[PDB]
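User: For a benchmark we're assembling, each entry needs the component sequences followed by a predicted structure for the full assembly. Here are entry 17's components. Please fill in the structure.
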Amino acid sequence: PHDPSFTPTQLAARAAYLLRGNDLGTMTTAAPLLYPHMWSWDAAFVAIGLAPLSVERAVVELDTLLSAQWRNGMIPHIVFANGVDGYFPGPARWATATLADNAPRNRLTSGITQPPVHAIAVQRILEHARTRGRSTRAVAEAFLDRRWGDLMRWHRWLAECRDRNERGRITLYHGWESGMANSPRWDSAYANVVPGKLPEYQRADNVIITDPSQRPSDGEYDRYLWLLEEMKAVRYDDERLPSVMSFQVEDVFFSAIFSVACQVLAEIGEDYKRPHADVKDLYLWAERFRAGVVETTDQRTGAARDFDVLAEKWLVTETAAQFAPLLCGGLPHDRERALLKLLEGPRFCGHPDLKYGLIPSTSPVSRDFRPREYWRGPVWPVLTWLFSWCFARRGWAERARLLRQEGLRQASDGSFAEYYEPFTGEPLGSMQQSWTAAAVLDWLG
Amino acid sequence: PHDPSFTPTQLAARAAYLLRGNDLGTMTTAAPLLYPHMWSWDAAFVAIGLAPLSVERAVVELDTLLSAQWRNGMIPHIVFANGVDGYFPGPARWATATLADNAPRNRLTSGITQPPVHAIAVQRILEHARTRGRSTRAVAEAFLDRRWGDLMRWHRWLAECRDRNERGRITLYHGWESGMANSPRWDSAYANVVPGKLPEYQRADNVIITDPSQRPSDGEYDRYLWLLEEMKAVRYDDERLPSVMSFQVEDVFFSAIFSVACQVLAEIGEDYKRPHADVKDLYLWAERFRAGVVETTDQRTGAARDFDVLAEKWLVTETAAQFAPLLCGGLPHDRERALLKLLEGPRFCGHPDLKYGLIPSTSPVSRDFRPREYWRGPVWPVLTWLFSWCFARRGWAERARLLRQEGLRQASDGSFAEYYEPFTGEPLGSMQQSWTAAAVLDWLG
Amino acid sequence: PHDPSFTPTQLAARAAYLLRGNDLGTMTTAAPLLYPHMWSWDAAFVAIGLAPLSVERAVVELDTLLSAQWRNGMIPHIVFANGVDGYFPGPARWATATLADNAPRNRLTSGITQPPVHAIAVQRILEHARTRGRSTRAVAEAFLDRRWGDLMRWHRWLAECRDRNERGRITLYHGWESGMANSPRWDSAYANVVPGKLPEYQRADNVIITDPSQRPSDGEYDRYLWLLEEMKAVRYDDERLPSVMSFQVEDVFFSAIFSVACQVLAEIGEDYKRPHADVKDLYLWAERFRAGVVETTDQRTGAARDFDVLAEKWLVTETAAQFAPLLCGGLPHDRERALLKLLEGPRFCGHPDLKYGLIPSTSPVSRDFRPREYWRGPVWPVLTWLFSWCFARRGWAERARLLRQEGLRQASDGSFAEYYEPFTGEPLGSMQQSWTAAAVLDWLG
Amino acid sequence: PHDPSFTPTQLAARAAYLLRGNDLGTMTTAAPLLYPHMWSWDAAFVAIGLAPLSVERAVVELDTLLSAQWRNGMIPHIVFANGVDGYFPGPARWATATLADNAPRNRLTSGITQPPVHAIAVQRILEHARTRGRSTRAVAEAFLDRRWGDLMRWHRWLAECRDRNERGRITLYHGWESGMANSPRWDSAYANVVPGKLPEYQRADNVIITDPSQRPSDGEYDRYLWLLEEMKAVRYDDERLPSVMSFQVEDVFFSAIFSVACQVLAEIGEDYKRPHADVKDLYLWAERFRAGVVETTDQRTGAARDFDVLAEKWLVTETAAQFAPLLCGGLPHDRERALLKLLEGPRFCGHPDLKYGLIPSTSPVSRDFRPREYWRGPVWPVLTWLFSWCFARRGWAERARLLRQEGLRQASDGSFAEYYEPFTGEPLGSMQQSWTAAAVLDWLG
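Assistant: Structure for entry 17:
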């Protein structure tokens, strides 16, 4: 009654209870109903959440994801559960099994990608395994033996096929590949996507989340689904997409995560005596994408910009993605101090009306801000976790600690919500969201 | 490496992870492999462990158990999982579905009972639900509406059919009904059980636990299975068992739990406006069994004795069951002080070689003590929990706290072992034992 | 910032820092400025708070108090610090050094008493000492050897000199002896106190606490100080007080504390082989004062009434002292259930406007309620602690737990306030109050 | 009992109780008896430990130290408490009041310096203050206004007067200035110190710590005290010390601490708009002393060497000071990996006989190792803390976490020992050492 929050032990227990409850056997759904399949970057965070519970099962989560890797190295953003419906677009709509030459056999997947947080999950698994003794280390090391090549092929596909011009930024062909479907970042690029005759469909997502203020609009879904038509028309061929896609953007946040992931995987490579050529390529990509991210930045504030490849235009918006350079490093000293002032100030974590000192997905002072509407404003625990972990890696121990503390305070209601209203703290999106439980589990230690 | 123990949050998370992992859907197995079905008093403890995680699912656990209640009110000690093998004796051996007129329809069960800890689980569910607000209170109250009569019929069957002579002690027809299969308590009664021609069988339990030092002997299993033959021969008829059973003992520990359970259920009855006649009967039974327990006690030490009904003999052994009167109250002041001195002294919790200050199942100084052998010596987390909870209810806050603290220290290895070696702390029995995880979850709060 | 509360470790650290900061050497002040001397029941709580930090120093605190015990057994409510000013009435006003035949030599004290919580502090010291090993047990046991007789003389003085008619209730000659100066309990007795020629004085308390809404009025202080004149006029002679005092009340809360303290001290005496005649007397007094408390109770609600000895009338008020019978036991079952319903319902802990689920000193629905005014409404951490500890000793583990949880939530601001505003949680009275820090330290474990 | 360790809250409480117990008013002694005055780098750590308890009192600690700063900027290593005896050499032996032109007025101090950890304490005070709201921020900011210039003069004195040749390393004229009196680092330099006519003296330190195995030898003390005679003979004149001192070493650990402290203080200066010329000088010194540390390093292992200025030779020893480059950064990637391998391997934290995974002051495999003898082997909580904090600032979050976890495990006995036996965990040196309590308080959060 007086305090509906849970203690740290109750919260850790409920988080673990949730993760096991979303386990289908060898894959964990991203949420019970809204996302009843395996999503790529959710699966990485699920592996992080499972590592304190079972290193073996955390490795299983990544093995399942990597078993769905495309022939060319791409990790698709959905690995569909066998016989499960209730998410749209589902496998019939993607038609990758029939159309895509590089699609896996004996797995059904989507035909687009998602950010490469996977190396970070591998590091957390290895860190847990090393505290657990010989048998558990052997599990994690056997996973490295079995999957190091697949991880390399994933990073190599990103570096070679989504950065064809060696600019150090990743090109996306769908806003879904950013992880942030309706971010204001993509609005001006989506405005130039004009659907042709689009085959009939009915959304599933807003049958589960019925409050229209919390999900994208019908007109946005028409553009999301039209881009699918464009990809299917060229049978998901990498070489043909640049010629046909109505949406081609360089995603600076994805690019910064890739830089970090390359550096992380390179250090794993050195510690576990992987091939020197692989380690050298990883360090090369880490520096290439760090530089690519820095090249986008405002010289006064450090804020990173996305780039619309079709319009040949920097995309200037006020979202959390602006803070990409903080994740990967590389900014000059003065510019990074300015970027931190922006982060901590009244446009983001310093905004006087926020319930928690956390990073809203869109600045509350932006014209684009909508406090309930998915990536247009709400506070996302997954981002809080990713920022806190990257900040700790930068050496910003107190900044990381504060994000963790506020994230745990927000999460102490036990809803494990997908995102939270930034002013009232109301849980929004799906409840029982796996990567929110995973963030809590990793934080609580 | 240096410290393989888990933090309170890691331990709570792993305990919850385990409980959900043993969940078959509407019943939780007592262990993954050794006990791959629902056991009656394990199910009560599972409900206690689930209450901090999901009041709804805790209620489901008790609903499933009570759906298997016999027509006469008996709660059987096993509710078998549909299609699951691997425990022996299984349903084919009991043959209750074919033979027992009072057996449930559409559930397969054993033909014997187990201690009535269920009311304690109901109290813990209600206590959790009241901290969680209106909707959760409604779940727990709807369970009371739906199951109060079944709980009454359970207590009434114990009081009327297993205490036919109104002595205030429960008669058992199998040592398995005590929850303590090979306790030294039953050795002299088992010595008078002479098997006839016993149908061939092969144990399953020692295929899973292969160390022979940790389980009962083949000769003990022959007697356990012969008693089954005696019960089947009279088709599990309550009225016929006293005439045919080679094993008839009054179990003072079971009797003390019943007294406590009656008092607990009576208080629930008063708080939730149940029928006055039911509450009055519960208080009557609570006092009858408190007196029955006290009547067994040594006048100098307070230690409670079991009674062999066939031999007409008090059973004097040195096991944790001696402390029955501490659970239910009723001893004169001087005698209870003596009993506490026995508990805290060098024969039990004070023994100088114990790794933890916990109650061994058999006194280490007894000729009967075997440090690995099931109920002949090891320390059982389930007993630690039951003693700590009953002690707190007596008002012995520090004694309860110390048992909890030592139990948590012992459990901090994360094996969730069925029992522990009292000197080395080695985990024994089944790992991943559900009621050990439940004790940890309840303790950690 | 977004949440100014302290973590448990920060709170425990700050509580201990405070207690050591208030240590003058061999006595701890009750607060830094408002109460810059040793008060008797504060000193008991200080000893409880010191026990987790230093058993030696906890023992010193009680040794210092008992060194000021009067020749007849009375423990006076203030032991003044040598050469310290800033509290009024000071030693000159009491004039016990010169007037009181029973006052101690080479300590300056007041001339009235306070509740006998001291045995509870001895129990907590012994419980800590027993967890700390041999040298620490030796310290606590030596304190018992040295002070058991003084503790007996304290209890004997209460039983013989403040319960002259063996009614099982303690008579007070000053409202200050209740520990609750301006409780509504005493208003009708104080209305019959008419000061004669009262020597001029200036208050000190409201120089420190200047907000007039938080302290008693000048008119009340005139009565407090006039009662001192009546005592001085008979030189504090126990035999003459009944003939001259304008204020003579039986305090049912003090009486219930005394019942509990006698039972606690008797159990200590048994455990440490103290003289049997002493233990027998303690148990006799425990039951006499239990019965005396029960005799006062409302036949419907169980609520305990104080008694005005001069007016020969029961004093019916709506304060926390009504709950005296819950501390010591003795109510018939049905009436204790009614009393608990009153405690947990909308007149006390269930009042809908309370910030915390805690017991206000006066019911918010009473015409006497004043949310800021000392004992006329505020929530006192010292009472939360006493009720929680007594409730645990009754066996009401969950009720005790809930009081401790809410008390720790309230105290997490780190002000260690004397009392708190019941609706807003505003800290009131002296900050850095020693017994509030002691409560927190005992709770946090 | 079965486990004498304290819970986190009990430990935090006892640490704070200790720190307040060692408070003389405006300075905290480094220990109760062994070190009954203010030491300079202890005072910095005391301020860190006080910051979670009282930002005001933490600031006072540094104000008291800086009030004893010499005219030339030097912070002396002892500020003597007025009229306190029991440490030798005391103020009479140093004779700085009468001989040293730069000694402060109305403070008594020693005549040598100690490592510049002070900026790290300022950062922790500011970080706490920023979580506590406006009044507390005002206190910390006022301290910066009042003392920024003194902090600059301290850093300037080190950079200009103890690095006269701009080598980026700090020259010591006494092994006591390293904070590590009897480190094997200094043995070959001390072998070239030949006392002349040394005035008679009696040690005080080994009257308190009487076990000869835990303190330096008489022969070492003769050399410590003779160096004082050489300084007094030139009246502590900075310009004359190079011409007369028999001990002149470049201390690479002190140098690395100075690099870190300059970087930390420069960031503070930027954040609080201090003069730009000061910030520029601080960053210049941070990089100069980083480079100076790196220049000393082994080309295979990265291990840092001290330099004997008189012998013009690198000092190669196997102590924790080898790890200086991990604190300040600057090693090439491959050599820093080698240095981390040395730290985590069998010569240091991975030695198989260590009770805790912590850094011994001297390698257990070195011929110089002595497991009880002050800096010749014991594990020092102060160094665990410094390494953990510096490692977190490098971004090595898991390495920092592991040091803190093991440090808290070691400290959970509550002795707050000066140092610990590396194999048995036996507390050694002074108990109730202030900077050990400070480490614990900072860690527990």
